[PDB]
Amino acid sequence: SDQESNNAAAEWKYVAMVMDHILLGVFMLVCIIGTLAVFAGRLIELNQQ
């Protein structure tokens, strides 16, 4: 019974790990996109002088 319970718990842990990996990718991508979307328009406008 303990082995079955641990297997179910490990399934939950695996789901959490997969969600963590997706969110790592999403949050790094969002950091890059926010940094660009805030500043790059004005920076390219100034560089085109």
Place this chain on the structure above:
Amino acid sequence: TSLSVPLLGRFLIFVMVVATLIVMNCVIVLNVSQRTPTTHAMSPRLRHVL
């Protein structure tokens, strides 16, 4: 002023960057150390390297 960066500011930004890199390093080391058979597979290449 903005003609140059003061030494104090340069040093503080440098140590902040070093601290950020070491935080990333600690996160990576913890990710590697707490891997268990029930979630992660045994990479033989990394094991042979390290």
